[PDB]
Amino acid sequence: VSDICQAADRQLYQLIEWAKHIPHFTELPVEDQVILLKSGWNELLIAGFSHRSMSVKDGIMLATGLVVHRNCAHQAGVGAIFDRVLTELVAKMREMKMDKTELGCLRSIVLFNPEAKGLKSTQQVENLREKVYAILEEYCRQTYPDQSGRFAKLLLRLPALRSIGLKCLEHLFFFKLVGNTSIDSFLLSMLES
Amino acid sequence: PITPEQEELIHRLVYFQNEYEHPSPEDIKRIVNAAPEEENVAEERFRHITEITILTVQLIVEFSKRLPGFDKLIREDQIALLKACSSEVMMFRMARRYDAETDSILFATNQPYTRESYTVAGMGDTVEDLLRFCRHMCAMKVDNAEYALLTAIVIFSERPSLSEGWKVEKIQEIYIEALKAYVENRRKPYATTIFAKLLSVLTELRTLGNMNSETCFSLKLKNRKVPSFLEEIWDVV
Numbered sequence A: 001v002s003d004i005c006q007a008a009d010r011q012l013y014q015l016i017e018w019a020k021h022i023p024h025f026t027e028l029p030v031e032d033q034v035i036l037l038k039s040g041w042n043e044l045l046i047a048g049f050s051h052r053s054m055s056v057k058d059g060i061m062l063a064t065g066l067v068v069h070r071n072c073a074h075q076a077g078v079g080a081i082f083d084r085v086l087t088e089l090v091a092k093m094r095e096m097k098m099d100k101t102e103l104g105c106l107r108s109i110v111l112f113n114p115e116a117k118g119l120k121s122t123q124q125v126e127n128l129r130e131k132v133y134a135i136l137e138e139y140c141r142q143t144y145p146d147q148s149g150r151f152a153k154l155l156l157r158l159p160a161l162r163s164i165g166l167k168c169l170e171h172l173f174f175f176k177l178v179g180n181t182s183i184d185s186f187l188l189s190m191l192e193s
Numbered sequence B: 001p002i003t004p005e006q007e008e009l010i011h012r013l014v015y016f017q018n019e020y021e022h023p024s025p026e027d028i029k030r031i032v033n034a035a036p037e038e039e040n041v042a043e044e045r046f047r048h049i050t051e052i053t054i055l056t057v058q059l060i061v062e063f064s065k066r067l068p069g070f071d072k073l074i075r076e077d078q079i080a081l082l083k084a085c086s087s088e089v090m091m092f093r094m095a096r097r098y099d100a101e102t103d104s105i106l107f108a109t110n111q112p113y114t115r116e117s118y119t120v121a122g123m124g125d126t127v128e129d130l131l132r133f134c135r136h137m138c139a140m141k142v143d144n145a146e147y148a149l150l151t152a153i154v155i156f157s158e159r160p161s162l163s164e165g166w167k168v169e170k171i172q173e174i175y176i177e178a179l180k181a182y183v184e185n186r187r188k189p190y191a192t193t194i195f196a197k198l199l200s201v202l203t204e205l206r207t208l209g210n211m212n213s214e215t216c217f218s219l220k221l222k223n224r225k226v227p228s229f230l231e232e233i234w235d236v237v
């Protein structure tokens, strides 16, 4: 298996497994679970490898090691977003020293998106998103008390992330995946495991 | 808790919001007395949409300049911020002319536009997304102060390429902080959840603004007249 290929393979496996373990996610209708992931897909993967590559210099890390540099962002599959990822997310992340708790929180606000297309349990998913808001607000307040704007600061990288997401004319790393099915068939079967 | 001299800041934005909300009835006049020889009937819908929107972007620029801190920026950055926020801020303006009952947007020509109106002008694609936003906003019961403060936070969004990004960043913090102060002091429960929900609207703007650009590309493909002012500002060519 290729170097970047198995990175992509692991990167998705880790994503889906991450969500499988978010409190209440799997209690939603499986179809909604696919919808939420199929839709949050890019922004979720992006935010993830963005934060993970804060220490990496001039690059994006992917599924341990494999630090993609601009000189082959196209190979990697992050050609459309590379520059902005480093400056609008990686840099800003490092600048505020955004921790793992916060990251997970934002990622969840992204996963629990009620405006997801065709989502059935919109009301449910919304209540879930709103818990994360509470949890995250209190977490900042407790952890970084002398930073009155941190909560909103963290919340405001969500649009930035969205924009970078819109630049992906596909679901990141999907065609590098071993199987050759449909996003939904891949998600669905990956969910049941 | 408790709002300080953000109170003054809020009166100002809420004032200017109100002030620059509607285009001068003379300009809306020019638009109506422009109908060509027996207008395409679906054109007196499309022309209104694009002509009046020139006025909208202008009003947006008008308000953006009366905002504290905008003058502390260099012309280069002032111009960048303006262009960047235009299509996003436009959606807040439209949302505020949304009629929940008739599910329409009351243009400045007292004409109510609906899924039809826009579909007739050839904008049937995006129309629904627009209406949905209007509905979601109406559902949140976003008031004037929140609306204004919010549009100000958008106008001061440090985008890449800005020369002094750090400065736009710092200025924006003031409005963010005043919105928090305001939302919390409505000493209503949920305050943090409301504040977070208000801010999220900003992520929604990135897709709506993208959609708008997408709509411009298409009108350019179908080769329909997109007012030069709009092409110049949204970089639509």
Ligand SMILES: CC(C)CC[C@@H](O)[C@](C)(O)[C@H]1CC[C@@]2(O)C3=CC(=O)[C@@H]4C[C@@H](O)[C@@H](O)C[C@]4(C)[C@H]3CC[C@]12C
Residues within 6 Å of the ligand: B021, B022, B023, B048, B049, B050, B052, B053, B054, B055, B056, B059, B090, B091, B093, B094, B095, B097, B105, B106, B107, B108, B109, B130, B212, B215, B216
């Ligand atoms: C690409 C471009 C042509 C499309 C923009 C379209 O999608 C929009 C966003 O749908 C445009 C179309 C016309 C429009 O500019 C308006 C008409 C008004 O009368 C008024 C003028 C002024 O009082 C605004 O504060 C509100 C309102 C309702 C604006 C809002 C934005 C609208 C509704």
